[PDB]
Every structure is written in structure tokens, then in C-alpha cells.
Write a protein that binds this ligand. Structure first.
Ligand code: LX0
Ligand code: FE
Length: 280
């Protein structure tokens, strides 16, 4: 039989660790509970609760934003660079202001039909990919601990807003993402793992070749000052994106990646994934 999967957008309704650097910080710990409760209480159709971020949270965002913006012009793909200024104009991307999930959700709705729902923390690859099928991106709302703004193994709102949002605003990329989600719905465990891995080494950590140069489109790179620099250093190993090979690569979840895969274009990666999903 087929495992349960969402058939409508509202069906997504039905889908701190003590060693976290911020656990021993009382305000960090308490605010994380606050963010977790907002996500848990959320139901499809609700406006995403807007949060008044603290000075410390804004300072961390500010550091991340300031340094990443120095790198984007030379490191990010053109699609990313095309869309970032629109977000800054319409959604309040500033060094001293954290954009709200509700604002970026509404921006994406009008651009590509993408929307956001808040998530408390970890969700399964199956669940996350299932959201993409409805052009729904599950986003965290909290900010990374101040101790390391340059890289965190835990995705935070900086990652969602600076890593993902500017590309979700691009029609070709939104289509590519949705198609992974669609392929995942009710798929076998093996199929989901393979799809999740291809997602990881494209949407999350992908590089592309644009006018002969390597650029990054991977959200996990676009939100990490240190890994973004590392990816294009270039002391990093690079391979051509090839789903039948890429899907077998181990996804590293507490370190920099060991390898980055290069796609020719969003359209090309989409086509390769189309051919690949037929085989699984
Ligand atoms: C196990 C891990 N899986 C996972 N899958 C994908 N596709 N991307 C990521 C991911 C994790 C961290 C980051 C942040 C990035 N390194 C940065 O420093 O900006 C960006 C992406 N993790 C994960 C996922 C969600 C979590 C939510 C809360 C806490 C831990 C999580 C771990
Ligand atoms: Fe991500």
C-alpha cells in the first residue's frame, strides 16, 4: 500500500536539546520555547505570528547579513542576486531588521505561489518534501546562537530568509522545488531518501556554472559565511550533478560538506530529476 500523504494544503496541519549552545542561556532557552509554541499552535490559513525580535537576535542577524552581503555579489548565482533587492524593498531586509515570515510568505505568494508555514524544529524529509508539493516551505522562526554566526548545524530563520527565500521567488527554481515534492508524495522510503539527497545537494548545497564561473545556489551555503567562502575557495571538491550518483552521497549534518555538485542550470537540474524520478 501507499503511506499517508497530504492531498490538500491544509493536510500539512496533520503531519531545546540540552546540548545546544544556547541551552545554558536562560533567555535563549525561554525564547526558543516561545518560538516552538507559536509554530505548534499554527494552523493553515492563520497569518504567521509576527515576532518582536530582541536586540541580541537582531545583532546576530545583522552580523550574518552584513558579512554575507559582502560575498553575494561574487559568490551567488544571478537569480539570487536578481531577487534579493526586491526582498529588501518589500520585506524589510536590513542590517537592523529581521524580516517577518508572514511578509516574506505574502511576497512569495504573489511571485511564485510559494508560501511559508512555521515549524518548531526538526521534521522528516518525507514531511518537508510533502510541503513543497503544495509550494509550502516549512520555516524556522528563531535565530542561531550568537556564539557562532558563521556556521550552525541547526537551520534557523537567518538560513530560511537569506538562504531560501530569494530563490523561492524565482519561477524556474520554484518549479524545480515543487517537482521534488510532487515526486515524493506517497513514494517508497528508498525513493524519499534518494529525492531528499538530490534536494540536499541542489537546493541546499548546490553550485551552478554561470557564464563559465562557479556560483552558489545552495541555501545552506548562502546562509553560512564560512561555508560560502569555503565552497568557492576553491579548496573544495566539486562534481557534476548527476541524480543516479548524487543520490548516493552522504549528507553531512554537523560539518561542511565533503563534496559539492554543479548543475548547469535550474532548467537542466529539473530535467535530470524528471528522468531520474521515472526510474524510482
Ligand atoms: C538533520 C538536519 N537535516 C538537514 N537537512 C537539510 N536539507 N538541511 C539542513 C540544514 C542544517 C543547517 C543549516 C544552516 C547552515 N549550515 C548555516 O550555518 O546557515 C542549513 C541546512 N539540515 C536537520 C534538519 C532540521 C532541523 C531542525 C531543527 C534542528 C535540527 C535540525 C537538523
Ligand atoms: Fe534549508
Amino acid at each position: 500500500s501507499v503511506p499517508w500523504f497530504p492531498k490538500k494544503i491544509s493536510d500539512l496541519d496533520h503531519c531545546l536539546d540540552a546540548d545546544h549552545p544556547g541551552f545554558k542561556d536562560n533567555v535563549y532557552r525561554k525564547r526558543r520555547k516561545y518560538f516552538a509554541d507559536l509554530a505548534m499552535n499554527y494552523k493553515h490559513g492563520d497569518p504567521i505570528p509576527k515576532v518582536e525580535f530582541t536586540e541580541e537576535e537582531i545583532k546576530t542577524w545583522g552580523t550574518v547579513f552584513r558579512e554575507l552581503n559582502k560575498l553575494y555579489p561574487t559568490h551567488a548565482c544571478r537569480e539570487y542576486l536578481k531577487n534579493l533587492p526586491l526582498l529588501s524593498k518589500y520585506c524589510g531586509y536590513r542590517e537592523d531588521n529581521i524580516p517577518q515570515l508572514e511578509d516574506v510568505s505574502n511576497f512569495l505568494k504573489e511571485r511564485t505561489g510559494f508560501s511559508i508555514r512555521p515549524v518548531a524544529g526538526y521534521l522528516s524529509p518525507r514531511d518537508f518534501l510533502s510541503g513543497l508539493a503544495f509550494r509550502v516551505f516549512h520555516c524556522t522562526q528563531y535565530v542561531r546562537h550568537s556564539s557562532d554566526p558563521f556556521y550552525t548545524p541547526e537551520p534557523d530563520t537567518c538560513h530560511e530568509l537569506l538562504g531560501h527565500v530569494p530563490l523561492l521567488a524565482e519561477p524556474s527554481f520554484a518549479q524545480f522545488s515543487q517537482e521534488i515534492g510532487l515526486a515524493s508524495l506517497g513514494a517508497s522510503e528508498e525513493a524519499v531518501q534518494k529525492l531528499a539527497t538530490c534536494y540536499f545537494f541542489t537546493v541546499e548545497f548546490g553550485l551552478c556554472k554561470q557564464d563559465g564561473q562557479l556560483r552558489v545556489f545552495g541555501a545552506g551555503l548562502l546562509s553560512s559565511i564560512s561555508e560560502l567562502k569555503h565552497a568557492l575557495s576553491g579548496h573544495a571538491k566539486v562534481k557534476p550533478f548527476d541524480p543516479k550518483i548524487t543520490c548516493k552521497q552522504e549528507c553531512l549534518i554537523t560539518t561542511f560538506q565533503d563534496v559539492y555538485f554543479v548543475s548547469e542550470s535550474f532548467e537542466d537540474a529539473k530535467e535530470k530529476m524528471r528522468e531520474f524520478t521515472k526510474t524510482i
